[PDB]
Amino acid sequence: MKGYTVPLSPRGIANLAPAPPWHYAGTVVGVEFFTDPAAAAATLPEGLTPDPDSAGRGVAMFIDWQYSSTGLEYLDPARSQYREFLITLDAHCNGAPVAWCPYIYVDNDAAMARGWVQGFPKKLGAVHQTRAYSVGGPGTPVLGPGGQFGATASSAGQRIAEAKITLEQPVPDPAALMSRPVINLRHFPRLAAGQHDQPAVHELVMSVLDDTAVSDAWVGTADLAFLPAHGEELADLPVRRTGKGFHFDLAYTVTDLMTLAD
Amino acid sequence: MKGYTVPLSPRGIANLAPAPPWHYAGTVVGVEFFTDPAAAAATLPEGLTPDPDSAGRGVAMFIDWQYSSTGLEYLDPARSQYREFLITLDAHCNGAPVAWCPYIYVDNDAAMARGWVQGFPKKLGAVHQTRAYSVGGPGTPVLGPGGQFGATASSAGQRIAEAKITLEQPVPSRPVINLRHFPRLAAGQHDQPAVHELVMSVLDDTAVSDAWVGTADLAFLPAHGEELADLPVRRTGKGFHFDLAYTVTDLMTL
Amino acid sequence: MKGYTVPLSPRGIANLAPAPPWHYAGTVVGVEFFTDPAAAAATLPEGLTPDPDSAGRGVAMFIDWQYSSTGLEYLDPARSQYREFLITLDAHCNGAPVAWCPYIYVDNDAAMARGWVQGFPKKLGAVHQTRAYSVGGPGTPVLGPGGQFGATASSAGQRIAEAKITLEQPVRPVINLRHFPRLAAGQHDQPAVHELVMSVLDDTAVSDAWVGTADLAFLPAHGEELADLPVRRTGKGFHFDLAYTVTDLMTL
Amino acid sequence: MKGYTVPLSPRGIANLAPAPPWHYAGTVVGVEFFTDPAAAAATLPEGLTPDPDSAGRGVAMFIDWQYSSTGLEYLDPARSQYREFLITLDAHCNGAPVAWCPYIYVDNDAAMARGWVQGFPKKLGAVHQTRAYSVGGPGTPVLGPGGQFGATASSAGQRIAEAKITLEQPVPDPAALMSRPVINLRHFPRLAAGQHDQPAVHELVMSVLDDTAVSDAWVGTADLAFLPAHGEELADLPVRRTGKGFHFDLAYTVTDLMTL
C-alpha cells in the first residue's frame, strides 16, 4: 500500500495526487475589489482579525494552471491542466498583513485534493478567461495597452462571478504582487457518532511557495460582479467598488506548509 | 464560522457537504467477479487478511444515486444526484467476512467530499447505467426476465470498466471496509498522514427492493493513472440489479 | 461513405446518429406556464399564427431520456442516455392548435444532431430533475399526492430555468423548423434548408401520469432569450413516463 | 425571427452561432503521420482521388482555439474558447493536392454548429494539449529546442488519440504549413419517410480562409497513436509511422465557403 492521497494502491499510481514537489505555471487575470468590511470579517477564522488599514479589500483571481511533479506530468494535460477561481481577503494575523482565502473553485479533482491538503477550500467549478495569442488578429486581445480580457466562474451550473479588465501599463514592481502571505485552514471532519462537531484536522496554516516567479505583468482597470447562487456565499461579499485589474504569469513549487495553530 | 466540510462559512451553506444525516436512494447494476487472489491481496490495508474461502472474489457496482439531508435537498438534482462506480474485494477482518473498497469513482464533488470523510477513496469519473422505465417499449429493457443492462465507467477521459447483465430471476451481509486518510504537507511529514485509520461503513435504516439476479459480462481496462485493471477479470459470477436506500449518521473506527 | 448524420465513414458507425427508427423512453417533469402573448408571438415562424384562445400559454418540460435504435443501443448509456429541457408555446397552424418549440437544450451531442434533423433547435446544456425511486425512504419523493420534484436547466454555465412541482391528483402536435444555413459568400441570408415541419411520433405511450401545483422561473442569461418569455403565472405541474418511436417527419 | 444557425429568435442572440465573420486565434500541436493508403482511400468522398505521391499521409492536430466575431465575443471565453482535435488525409482533387477531413472533435456546441455549416464533421470530445508559459520553470516546457508537448483526445469517455512532440528548430517555411486546402462535406439528412437515403444537403466543399497568419512555428519529432473506441472509426486509420511534429500559432477569419 503506497501513495500520498487516496486511493492508496499497490503501485502508488492511482492516488489523486502524489507527494510533493508540486510545480505550477499559470496565467492570472486578477481584480482588486472592495466589499463591506463586516462581510469580509464574518468569513475570518479564529486567529485572524480585520485588517486595521484595508478591511474589506480583496483580490479575485482567475487562473489557467498547468501542474507538474518530478516526471513531466505536464505532458498529460488531461490531468495536469486546470482552471481556478479564488478570492482572498485582506486581514491581519498577530499584527501582520495576510490574505485569507474563504472560497476557491477548480475544474479538476486532482487540484481539489491538493488544495484540501494545503487547506485551500476547493469546490468544483467552471472557470474561463480570455487568452492572448502571440499570432495576433481579431480573435485575440493584445497583451499590452488596450488589451481587454474577460473571465467567469460558475458552480453547479450557476454563474457566481463575471469580470473584465483593460490593460494600461506594465506592473512597476512585479515582485510586489501578492506580497501578503496567504492563510488557509486545513479541515477534515469526523463522522463517528457524537463527533460531527469535533474535526480530526482543524488547523490554521500559512501557504509556503518555493521559487516564486512572476513575468509579463500588466495593470489596468477592472469590472467585477459576484452573483447570488444556491449553495454558495460568495455574493455575500458584494462588490462595492473595483480597483486595479491585473494580468501576469505566475510560477512556483510546493514542498511545505506552515502550521500556525491547531 | 460554520459548516461540516470545507469551505467553512458564515452561514454554513457553502460547505461541500453539511453534517449528517445523509440519506441515499439508488439503483444498482452489479457484477460478481473473480480476480487473482494475490492481486486482490495486494490492495489490502494492513488490518485486513485474505478471505480464506473466497479470496479473489469481488463485486463491481454502478449506481445512480440521489442524495438528501434534512431539508429536501433531493429537490436540487444539480447537486444531489450523482453516479458512482466502485469495486469491493472479499477479505477478512478478525475471522469475519468483509468487503474492502480500493477504488471508487463519482461524478459529483459533494459526493467526493462525503466519500473521503467516510474513507471511500473517491476520484472523479463518468459513470452510466442502462435505466428501466415502467412505460416500456423499444427504448427500455424490461425490469424482469431477459432484461439487458449495460454500464460503463471512465476516469480522466479513459474508459476503465464496461459491463452488461441479463436478468433471469427475482431475488429469493458483508460490511464494507474503508480507510480514512488525510496526508500532511509540512516538510519532513509527507509520509506521516494526519488521519490514517481503518473504518467500517455503518448504514442506518437499510432497504433493498426490486432485486433481480442473472448473468454478467465485465471488463476492466488499463488506463494511465489508474490501477483497477491490475485486478484482471478471470471470470464473472452473477449479475444483479436492485434499489438500495440507507442513511449515514455514524462510522466505526477499527 | 456510409452513415446518416455526419461523420460519414467507411462503416457507418462513427456518425452521431444512424438512420431511424429512433426509440425513446423517458420520465417528464413539466410545468404549464403563461407568458405575455406578444412575447410568445415574437418567436413564431412564418406560417404560424397566434392562438386565438390561449396565446401566451406554454409548456416547460424537463426529461430524462433513454434512446435506442435497432441494436439495443440503450446498453451504451454513455451515448444513449440524455437529459432535455424544452418549451413549447401555444399557436395556430392554418387554424389548428399546435405547440411551437422555440428553445430546447440537451446534454448529449447525438441528441443535438438528431434534434437538428427533426428541426428541434437544440443547444447543449445541463439539465436535471428529481427522481422517484421505488425503494422509497428519505432520499426520494414518493410518486402520488404530496410528492415533490425539482428541476433545473443551465446553458454555458448559466442557470436559465428553475422549477418545482407538487403532485396532487392522477390523470397539440409539436411544430419545428428545419434550418441549415449557407456559408457561401452572398448567401448568408439564404439558408439551404428552411422548412416548417410537424413532429410525427409512432407508437406513443404515456404512463403513471400525475398533475399538481407548480413553480417556474426563467432567468436572464447572456446569449439566451428564454427569459424574454417571462413566466407571468404557472398552471399545472405534471409528471409522467413517455415512450415513442421516430421514423418520419411531416413537411408543412 | 432573426439569427444565422438555430435557434432562430426574436433578437438573433440565442442562435448557436451568428452570421460571419468568424475570427479564430489558436495554438496548434500537430503530428504528421502515415497510415495504410487503402485505409485513407476508404474514407474519401466521391470527388476526391488518392494522392499519387503521398497516399496514406495525414496530419493530426490538437488546437486551443479562441473565437470571436464583430463584438469582442472573445471576452466571453465560456462560449468562445474551445479545444479541437482533427485529422486530415492527403488526397487529390482534379490533379491538385488537398487535405480531406474525415473526423474532427470539439468541446463546445457553438463550434460544433459552425463546423457543421462549414462541412467539418464535428462531434463532441475532450481535447487537451500541454501549454508553454512565458514565465518558465518546472511547470512548463520551453517553446524552443527540447520543448516536449503532450496532447490527447477522448470521445464519449473513451480515449481515441495520444500524442507527444519534441521541438527541434523553427519551421523553415511557416507560410507553407498546411498549404493543402482542406476539403469537407456539408451534409444534412432528411427524415421524411422514404427519404432517409436522400439527404437535403450533400456537397463537397473547400474551406476558404481569410487573412491567414502563422507565428512562432517550430518543428521536431513526434509520437502518435489512435486507439480503438466504440462508435468511432479513427483507429481504423492506424498510425504505421510518424513524421514531423509541429507547434505553431494560427489565425484566420471565415466569411466564405467554396462549393465544389
Q: What Å distances lie between residue A49 and A89, A93, B12, B219, C175, CA to CA?
A: 11, 6, 20, 56, 62
Contacts with C75 from chain B: Cβ below 8 Å: 130, 148-150, 164
Q: Which residues contact C100 (CB under 8 A, 6 or more apart)?
A: C43, C44, C45, C48, C88, C89, C90, C91, C174, C175
Give the residue among A200, A193, C136 at the shortest CA–CA distance from B202: A193
Q: Spell out the SS3 assignment of chain B.
A: CECCCCCCECCCCCCCCCCCCEEEEEEEEEEEEECCHHHHHHCCCCCCEECCCCCCEEEEEEEEEEEECCCCHHHCHHHHEEEEEEEEEEEEECCEEEEEEEEEEECCHHHHHHHHHHCCCEEECEEEECCCCCCCCCCCCCCCCCCEEEEEEEECCEEEEEEEEEEEEECCCCCEEEEEEECCCCCCCCCCCCEEEEEEECCEEEEEEEEEEEEEEEEECCCCCCCHHHCCCCEEEEEEEEEEEEEECCEEEC
Binding-face residues of A in 202-231 toward B, CB within 8 A: 230-231
Q: Is C24 annotated as a binding residue?
A: yes
What CATH number does residue A59 fall under? 2.40.400.10
Binding-face residues of D in 40-69 toward C, CB within 8 A: 42-46
Cell 418549440: give the residue: C101
Give the residue among A99, A98, A5 at the shortest CA–CA distance from A61: A99
Classify burial at A68, counting beta carbons within 10 Å of its beta carbon; exposed 0-12, middle 13-18, buried 19 or more.
Answer: buried
Question: What sign does the CA torsion over B98, B103, B108, B111 have?
Answer: positive
Contacts with C226 from chain D: Cβ below 8 Å: 14
Task: Tell if the CB–CB gap between A151 and D77 is shorter than 8 Å.
Answer: yes
User: A154 touching C, CB under 8 A?
Assistant: yes
Residues after which chain D has a gap (C–N > 2.5 Å): none
Task: Tell if the CB–CB gap between A152 and D68 is shorter than 8 Å.
Answer: no
Contacts with C157 from chain A: Cβ below 8 Å: 126, 152, 154, 157-159
Give the residue among C58, C64, C22, C6 at the shortest CA–CA distance from C37: C58
CB contact at 8 A, B115 and B67: no
For residue A128, give the chain C residue with the closest CA. C157
Overall number of domains in chain C:
1
Angle between helix C109-118 and helix D109-118 axes, rounded to 10 deg: 50
CB contact at 8 A, D120 and D103: no
For residue B229, give the chain A residue with the closest CA. A14
Contacts with B42 from chain A: Cβ below 8 Å: 10
Q: What is the resolution of this structure in A?
A: 1.8
Task: Tell if the CB–CB gap between C192 and D189 is shorter than 8 Å.
Answer: no
3-class secondary-structure state, position A132: coil
Question: What sign does the CA torsion over D102, D108, D109, D114 have?
Answer: negative
CB contact at 8 A, B232 and B158: no
User: B157 touching D, CB under 8 A?
Assistant: yes
For residue D160, give the chain B residue with the closest CA. B158
Task: Tell if the CB–CB gap between D213 and A75 is shorter than 8 Å.
Answer: no
Q: Which residue among B25, B138, B152 sits closest to C68, beta carbon to beta carbon?
A: B138
The DSSP letter of residue A115 is H
Task: Tell if the CB–CB gap between B117 and A6 is shorter than 8 Å.
Answer: no
Q: What Å distances lie between residue D24 and A136, C196, D77, D173, D193, CA to CA?
A: 10, 33, 13, 22, 40
Contacts with D193 from chain C: Cβ below 8 Å: 247-248
Give the residue among A236, C8, D46 at the shortest CA–CA distance from B2: A236
Give the CA angle between residues B32, B34, B38 to the nearest 5°. 140
Amino acid sitting at position D75:
L
Q: Which residue among A135, A164, A253 sits closest to D215, beta carbon to beta carbon?
A: A135
Task: Tell if the CB–CB gap between C14 and D103 is shorter than 8 Å.
Answer: yes
Classify burial at C54, counting beta carbons within 10 Å of its beta carbon; exposed 0-12, middle 13-18, buried 19 or more.
Answer: middle
* Cell numbers placing C42: 415574437
Cell 462549393: give the residue: D259
Rounded CA-CA distance D254/D81 in Å is: 16
Give the residue among A75, A108, A225 at the shortest CA–CA distance from A159: A225
The DSSP letter of residue A179 is -
Strand spans (E) along A94-135: 96-106, 122-124, 126-129
Strand spans (E) along A69-172: 81-93, 96-106, 122-124, 126-129, 148-155, 158-170
3-class secondary-structure state, position A73: helix
User: A240 touching B, CB under 8 A?
Assistant: no
Q: Which residue among A64, A140, A211 sits closest to D137, beta carbon to beta carbon?
A: A211
User: C76 touching D, CB under 8 A?
Assistant: yes
User: B31 touching D, CB under 8 A?
Assistant: no
Q: What is the DSSP string of A28-52?
A: EEEEEEE--HHHHHHTPPTT-EE-T
Q: How far is C184 from chain B (nearest CA, A)?
A: 37
**Which site among C73, C131, C247 would you substitute to test the B interface, given the most B Cβ atoms closer than 10 Å to its Cβ?**
C131
* Cell numbers placing A43: 468569513
Binding-face residues of A in 86-125 toward D, CB within 8 A: none
- Count the helix, strand and coil residues of chain A and give each as a percent rounded to the nearest 5: 10, 50, 40
Experimental technique: X-ray
Query: Which chains are within 8 Å of D by 3+ CB pairs?
Result: A, B, C
* Cell numbers placing C47: 406560417
Q: Is B114 annotated as a binding residue?
A: yes
Q: What Å distances lie between residue A28 and A68, A148, B121, CA to CA?
A: 18, 13, 32
Rounded CA-CA distance B70/C44 in Å is: 45
Contacts with C163 from chain A: Cβ below 8 Å: none
CB contact at 8 A, B25 and B208: no
Exposure pattern of D15-44 as b/e (b: 16+ CB <10 Å)? bbbbbbebbbbbbbbbbbbbbebebbbbbb
For residue D7, give the chain C residue with the closest CA. C121
Q: Which residues on adjacent β-strands are paired with residue B88? A: B59
Domain, as residue range, for C41: 1-252
Q: Is B83 annotated as a binding residue?
A: no
Q: Spell out the SS3 assignment of chain C.
A: CECCCCCCECCCCCCCCCCCCEEEEEEEEEEEEECCHHHHHHCCCCCCECCCCCCCEEEEEEEEEEEECCCCHHHCHHHHEEEEEEEEEEEEECCEEEEEEEEEEECCHHHHHHHHHHCCCEEECEEEECCCCCCCCCCCCCCCCCCEEEEEEEECCEEEEEEEEEEEEECCCEEEEEEECCCCCCCCCCCCEEEEEEECCEEEEEEEEEEEEEEEEECCCCCCCHHHCCCCEEEEEEEEEEEEEECCEEEC
Backbone angles phi, psi at A174, to 5 degrees: -45, -35
Q: Spell out the SS3 assignment of chain D.
A: CECCCCCCECCCCCCCCCCCCEEEEEEEEEEEEECCHHHHHHHCCCCCEECCCCCCEEEEEEEEEEEECCCCHHHCHHHHEEEEEEEEEEEEECCEEEEEEEEEEECCHHHHHHHHHHCCCEEECEEEECCCCCCCCCCCCCCCCCCEEEEEEEECCEEEEEEEEEEEEECCCHHHCCCCCEEEEEEECCCCCCCCCCCCEEEEEEECCEEEEEEEEEEEEEEEEECCCCCCCHHHCCCCEEEEEEEEEEEEEECCEEEC
Rounded CA-CA distance B192/B5 in Å is: 22
Q: What Å distances lie between residue C131 and A158, B75, B102, B176, C27, CA to CA?
A: 21, 9, 29, 26, 9
User: A191 touching B, CB under 8 A?
Assistant: yes
Rounded CA-CA distance C58/C235 in Å is: 10
User: C38 touching D, CB under 8 A?
Assistant: no
For residue C160, give the chain A residue with the closest CA. A158
Q: What Å distances lie between residue D240 and D56, D66, D227, D237, CA to CA?
A: 10, 33, 13, 9
